[PDB]
Amino acid sequence: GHMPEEVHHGEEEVETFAFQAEIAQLMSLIINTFYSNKEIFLRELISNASDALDKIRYESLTDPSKLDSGKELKIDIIPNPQERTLTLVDTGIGMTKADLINNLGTIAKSGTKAFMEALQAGADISMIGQFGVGFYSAYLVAEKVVVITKHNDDEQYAWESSAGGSFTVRADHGEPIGRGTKVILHLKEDQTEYLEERRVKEVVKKHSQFIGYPITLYL
Numbered sequence: 290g291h292m293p294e295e296v297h298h299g300e301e302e303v304e305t306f307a308f309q310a311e312i313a314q315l316m317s318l319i320i321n322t323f324y325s326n327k328e329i330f331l332r333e334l335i336s337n338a339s340d341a342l343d344k345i346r347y348e349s350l351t352d353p354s355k356l357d358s359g360k361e362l363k364i365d366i367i368p369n370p371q372e373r374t375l376t377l378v379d380t381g382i383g384m385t386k387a388d389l390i391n392n393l394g395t396i397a398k399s400g401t402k403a404f405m406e407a408l409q410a411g412a413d414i415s416m417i418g419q420f421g422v423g424f425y426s427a428y429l430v431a432e433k434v435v436v437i438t439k440h441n442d443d444e445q446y447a448w449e450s451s452a453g454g455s456f457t458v459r460a461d462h463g464e465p466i467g468r469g470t471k472v473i474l475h476l477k478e479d480q481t482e483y484l485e486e487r488r489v490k491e492v493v494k495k496h497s498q499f500i501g502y503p504i505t506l507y508l
């Protein structure tokens with residue numbers, strides 16, 4: 290053939306953005322600081338999933354066709370010892386691309402700044418959910434976090450950050466999740482206990498025993 294060259298893709302495939310400084314500061318705090326009960330990261334992620342499931346469960350009352358992307362409201366947890374990943378998948382309402390960028394990169398500024406002020410005044414890490422920013426507690430155990438999300442009104446997107454002050458967002462051309470959010474935790478070397486499922490059960494039973502949706506473990 291010839292050697293055509295595509296000088297210009299139609300649209301930027303991957304976009305990289307900086308966190309608001311206060312979000313980056315909290316992430317650095319979380320990822321570098323000792324905490325005696327890091328298992329609370331799972332409670333915070335399950336709590337976000339439960340809220341997203343509540344959200345779609347409500348809108349299904351007005352519009353039952355919002356469930357055409359999936360009728361089951363559930364949470365699945367998948368440890369992968371060979372990849373050192375722990376994955377949380379929910380069939381909640383999901384996030385549009387705009388809300389993915391805004392919620393994780395920008396408007397968490399107020400909660401993260403108030404939480405750091407509370408920490409300086411004597412609060413501790415386990416209170417992070419009272420400031421609406423419990424998601425960042427993932428970096429207690431993870432060196433890298435991927436968020437895959439699909440909202441009925443938008444396309445499936447992938448967010449990722451290793452807490453170096455920036456994150457990337459891209460169209461996800463991967464396994465389609467239908468609707469909801471998938472959080473993939475790339476675990477730190479010394480936190481692989483959360484790949485053992487005797488441990489994961491322990492943590493769910495301790496912290497999330499009264500979530501109103503089924504939690505299934507895959508191993």
Ligand SMILES: CC(C)c1cc(C(=O)N2Cc3ccccc3C2)c(O)cc1C=O
Pocket residue numbers: 333334335337338339340341342344379381382383384424436438469470472
């Ligand atoms: C990345 C993190 C913040 C997260 C987001 C969602 C999500 O898609 N939301 C959460 C929420 C809450 C209230 C209304 C709508 C939505 C939409 C989720 O299901 C799980 C997590 C795992 O921590």
